[model samples]
Target: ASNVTNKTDPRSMNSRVFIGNLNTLVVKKSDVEAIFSKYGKIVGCSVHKGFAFVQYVNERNARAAVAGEDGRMIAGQVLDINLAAEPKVNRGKAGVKRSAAEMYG
Candidate 1:
């Protein structure tokens, strides 16, 4: 197996941010985090089927993220950064409970 290393330090973690215009080529959490980790500490990264959400630990780091480049290069694609809102409902919850049909059928 090949060894892996994260070049960016963990101090870059900050508040949550929405990433749009994400390059289809970049679709993994590590890849997304690696891209934004340049701005500040990346608390975590959640990549959807196409787009992604990035979280930072503090406002100062968040501001730094917004002020930086408009387009970020990663995995042969560029990404746009913007503030993202908290999710209204938990998707994990939906998966935990099954519908009546699924349970009865």
Candidate 2:
């Protein structure tokens, strides 16, 4: 007999949740950690512009937080939570590169 292990459950891997509609003026990293930390170990929490990304140790915790806290009011604003989509990577110069002819002529 073989001792094969299965790892199909999404919870086996780390998960990140997207929190939107946040009041950027009032929401801070600490504010996000304060609530999400309860669900599981917070690997990372980033609050930006008007949204946030919370990474949990595993999917189970992420799901729990989304299910329980989505649509919940915080900092006088209702929050929207969902599984984070694959983030787009922008790896290049900030602006367009122009040829010498285009720049000088």
Candidate 3:
């Protein structure tokens, strides 16, 4: 509801599972929402080119959705489910995302 627990709140950001490896060609918003609703109460639902997002009312539901639906066949394709919270933006090589200005300064 209202597209949030709060628009910018981390918990709200965390309340969704990133559905990747999705088939946008066959999986519409309605199709995605219906499938995920089995695991939780969906508040926000959307489908994009390569992935989708389904926001639940709470983080626990998001977690549960990942647990139950990940790698499950949808439209004959296996979808990847992951928590949407920016769990670790600082991932990859040491300072891989470090400021480009640092080297020149």
Candidate 4:
């Protein structure tokens, strides 16, 4: 979005960085790679909606990317960078429950 400012909040430590406030019109996977590759080996990069996820080979590179790229301008917009949040694990029941006798048999 034009004239919109980006915000980043520190979260859990990981080997992934969440890039936000991207200009959908110009920001692409290549653009992200070009910028981030300088800091470390990019394992993968995915762009979705108006944001992106960049994963590095290790936590050190990830932290370096965040420190060097956070608040940097891309496609005329300020990009937000922070450690990626861990996805919530669903602990719900996965299948039909079976009796112990049935399982043992």
Candidate 5:
């Protein structure tokens, strides 16, 4: 009999990659790719709003990238890289509860 292994869990996949102090003035997807690519293939790289994320091909690569770049500078700004958490959907700011006419009348 062959050993049975579960591999469908999304967390089991290569899903750990995060970054901060992302040089808002100079950090681009390509720049992130360049920094992380030294460890392994950069599966995905993007800067949303003002933050950035980089996902490597596997856990080993992720670890290497994190270790190699714990405090490295890119584009003249020091970077903060680490494992990522599942991304949440941005719902924008909450609406105010006050009514428009309450104070205007």
Candidate 6:
């Protein structure tokens, strides 16, 4: 139910942001938006579980957000934010056979 992806590619990654240390223990969808703080056009936002993502309409916006907010201290915790990058293309795109039944493993 995740991956607001596959239908699109966020125009090659620079528009995507990966933030962590949220854990959802002290944050939510509303609270997370301020992390970007009117920095750019956020087209997609889905905050949950361990981390969250912010999709900007432009590349420079993501770049600008990262430089402005990585290692920001708040609520007695430090947030680790970074511009989502394709770290070394790993050739693991191959999928298995068809899906017929469950618990077959």
Task: Give TM per candidate.
Answer: 0.55, 0.65, 0.74, 0.66, 0.62, 0.66
Evaluate candidate 4 by giving its C-alpha RMSD to the native, one decimal.
17.0
Q: What digit string (tens of lDDT, one per residue) describes model 4 on residues 1-105?
A: 111112233421377777766676897776778888898787677777777877776778878988787667778666666667542232122211334133224
lDDT of each: 0.54, 0.63, 0.73, 0.64, 0.58, 0.61
lDDT of 1 by residue, 46-70 (tens): 7765466666766576667755633
Task: Compute the lDDT of residue 44 as modeled in candidate 5.
Answer: 65
Sliding window of 10 residues with minimal summed lDDT for model 6: 87-96
* Total colliding residue pairs, candidate 2: 0
Q: Pick the candidate with the highest TM-score.
A: 3
Per-residue CA lDDT of model 2 for 19-42, tens digit only, reads: 776776887777778788887678
Off by over 4 Å in 6: 1-12, 86-105
Instruction: List per-candidate RMSD values in Å.
Output: 12.6, 14.8, 10.7, 17.0, 14.0, 12.7
Better of 5 and 6 by TM-score: 6
The digit string of per-residue lDDT tens for model 6 on 34-96 reads 667577667667686766777787778888777666556545555566667742222122212
lDDT of 2 at 40: 68
RMSD of 3: 10.7
lDDT of 3 at 72: 73
Higher lDDT: candidate 2 or 3?
3
Estimate the overall C-alpha local distance difference test score of candidate 1: 0.54
lDDT at residue 56 of model 6 (Cα atoms)? 80
Error of 4 at 43 (Å): 1.0
Which of 3 and 4 is the better model by lDDT?
Answer: 3
Winner on lDDT between 1 and 2 is 2
The alpha-carbon root-mean-square deviation between model 6 and the true structure, to one decimal in Å, is 12.7
| Residue pair clashes in candidate 4 | none
